[PDB]
Swiss-Prot record, chain A:
Family membership: Belongs to the class-II aminoacyl-tRNA synthetase family.
Compartments where located: Cytoplasm
Reaction catalyzed: tRNA(His) + L-histidine + ATP = L-histidyl-tRNA(His) + AMP + diphosphate + H(+)
Record protein name field: Histidine--tRNA ligase, cytoplasmic
Originating organism: Homo sapiens
PROSITE patterns: AA_TRNA_LIGASE_II, WHEP_TRS_1, WHEP_TRS_2
Matching SUPFAM superfamilies: Class II aaRS ABD-related, Class II aaRS and biotin synthetases, S15/NS1 RNA-binding domain
Gene3D superfamilies: Anticodon-binding domain, Bira Bifunctional Protein, Domain 2, S15/NS1, RNA-binding
Length: 426, 427
């Protein structure tokens, strides 16, 4: 027996938590700016709700057959139908459980707008949220790729893709973000085996990218014009863009006739965020799912987004690591210390007074520690200030304040100490 | 052939927006306080390797071929593992996460804070109670007490009275029953439970029924019979010390020494305490035997902490907020951008994002040409303080009408000053 931490999971050390909290604020702060409610489902659901092989089921033991949440949407769907809710605007930040082999337990963090409203407003609302978040985390410049479901289905039918192949062929064009075409095309003649012309026909569309001007192209496009499905898709995006502009977000999104992710969740718009030298953020419209868990069969429309928080964490830690910025684990502002020996009792009386005042203070749990040890504790923890008590200082109504970085002491009258401590900090 | 239903696994409930709101209010009071005491924070995963937790009320996972795992039932065993794996002498941490117990809740938030390390006598344990009274005070539920005791005394006092060792555990089991029940009832339980001779029962009754502050310990040190037990003495001293530190902390008056308090007797080895509102609101104490035990070379890690019954506190706050008749908002949105006229959605969109860019928590109905009254009601239900009204003629004059949802009053306000003036009105 070896002391392990279940294959595919790692703890968050205090440094690591300290990073996630910096992250989650930015994220949450932003959600709350857009008026989302927040929910929480339990960690497991009945297995019966997640069936109708990469899921952790739980042993029998007599009760019901449960299994851990792999999703944050399937719980969101259950929540909505249990509580018979027409519409809702929620985010939910929680750990999710996939049994992959390439994390196995990892934070997913999504925000969704369930409900029935006019076309693209919430969809555009979503994109502005990602851009807010991706900007405020500061992690560099980003693009946001945008497709639409109806488009793919429509064009593939125009170039001439069978349905059997369709969904296995769009998954080919979906690795085009990381690969090249002369490769992609050949993994389309060995895989399923397109004809030389049909592959070309697809390529000649898919390799195009850019913004608003591209979408104005494909309508005026002769070939793309006389097909009902995809045209409707293009109209949606024409609208989506005007909305985006009023948001000032036009410049940060690009239309990619190539993006074909979540092909089995999405019904309209699709998008994936991209950082500039992966799946930092992704989402889109999926009107099919809510819908399913409801008894009667009444569709519930939804657009959303999730943020790959675990990829983000490690980009941030690293950015600070590079910056030689120390990442403090504790928030403590003052350490109450003393030079001489029999003074604990007075140090105790002082911390309590600081705490009572809302000052983030601390104490070394010894009688008679030595000042070098106490200053060391500080220069390590990142504590800015030390409050030294000493017999002479006390019979003076005075407490010495020494700054750990500057090493300068100032003696401060008892009362003022609180205002003076708070004044240095903020 | 099997009736499928939208259930949520037995002994588990979701958190609704309103319940999340409350829990957020509570967790802040808690955490804000740990942070004031300089605690670090850790996160274990939700499951461990079965064998870690074992060496029946434990959620196992299906084999499926990998390693055999089970859901954490406790926050301490993962604490133990975090220490051995990271080769750590000491730490001052808090950890607030859900736990899993197949009971007769099954998924309930636990929230404990711990001081692990090898320090002098009672300073951690004192700094622990001071944290309790800080939290229980801030949460603003009514007055409270923290009952205190020390394992070494129970061990001493029972042995002096003449309870067997076998009998030992059940007998405290019935004196811990004594908070809820009357001594006549307990006593009889002890002579219908095991069979403590009435005299052993009576002797216990004399001690167990007393309670007070320092002076009760000052007394139990003068007690002829107690003093001559090495164990009881060591403990009483530790309390006598714990108290002087508590006075310095000015918490003295909030805690009463209750010799009857016999909870947690496999975990705890020193101080034991439980808060009592005036429930299992908060509990804790010294358990030196448990962290170490997961170390290779047998090295003991002494430790004292507390956990706060966040589950019970959650309802006390909601109940208190309902009663106080104060509407609990589920969203922080400060402004709805709205209009009265028709062709206006587009200028409303310009405005919400302008407000977003300034960090204002703003909102807007997902509807082209909504009706003012519909908009306005949305704010009364939401709790939204303000409504920004766009109108063709206001917008040519560069003005926006600001209407205060509760006072119903309109001020037309220039575009630049709107953000700052909205901010002046909120905070």
């Amino acid at each position: 027996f070896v002391l392990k931490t279940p294959k595919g999971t790692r703890d968050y050390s205090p440094r690591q938590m300290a990073v996630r909290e910096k992250v989650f604020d930015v994220i949450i702060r932003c959600f709350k700016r857009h008026g989302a409610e927040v929910i929480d489902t339990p960690v497991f659901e009945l297995k019966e709700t997640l069936m109708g092989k990469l899921i952790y089921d739980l042993k029998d033991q007599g009760g019901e057959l449960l299994s851990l949440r792999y999703d944050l949407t399937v719980p969101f769907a259950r929540y909505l139908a249990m509580n018979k809710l027409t519409n809702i605007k929620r985010y939910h930040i929680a750990k999710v459980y996939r049994r992959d082999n390439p994390y196995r337990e990892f934070y997913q963090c999504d925000f969704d707008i369930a409900g029935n409203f006019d076309p693209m407003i919430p969809d555009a609302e979503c994109l502005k949220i990602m851009c807010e978040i991706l900007s405020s985390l500061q992690i560099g410049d980003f693009l946001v790729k945008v497709n639409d479901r109806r488009i793919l289905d429509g064009m593939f039918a125009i170039c001439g893709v069978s349905d059997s192949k369709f969904r296995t062929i769009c998954s080919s064009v979906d690795k085009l973000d990381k690969v090249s075409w002369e490769e992609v095309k050949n993994e389309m003649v060995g895989e399923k085996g397109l004809a030389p012309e049909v592959a070309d026909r697809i390529g000649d569309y898919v390799q195009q990218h850019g913004g608003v001007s591209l979408v104005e192209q494909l309508l005026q496009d002769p070939k793309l014009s006389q097909n009902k499905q995809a045209l409707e898709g293009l109209g949606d995006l024409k609208l989506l863009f005007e909305y985006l502009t009023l948001f000032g977000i036009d410049d940060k999104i690009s239309f990619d006739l190539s993006l074909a992710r979540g092909l089995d969740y999405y019904t309209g718009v699709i998008y994936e965020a991209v950082l500039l030298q992966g799946s930092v953020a992704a989402g889109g419209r999926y009107d099919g799912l809510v819908g399913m868990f409801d008894p009667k069969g009444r569709k519930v429309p939804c657009v959303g987004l999730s943020i790959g928080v675990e990829r983000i964490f490690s980009i941030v830690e690293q950015r600070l690591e590079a910056l030689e910025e120390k990442i403090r684990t504790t928030e403590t502002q003052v350490l109450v210390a003393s030079a001489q020996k029999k003074l604990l009792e007075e140090r105790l009386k002082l911390v309590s007074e600081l705490w009572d005042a809302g000052i983030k203070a601390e104490l070394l749990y010894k009688k008679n520690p030595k000042l070098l040890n106490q200053l060391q504790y500080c220069e390590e923890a990142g504590i800015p200030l030390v409050a030294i008590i000493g017999e002479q200082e006390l019979k003076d109504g005075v407490i010495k304040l020494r700054s750990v970085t500057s090493r300068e002491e100032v003696d401060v009258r008892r009362e003022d100490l609180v205002e003076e401590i708070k004044r240095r900090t903020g």
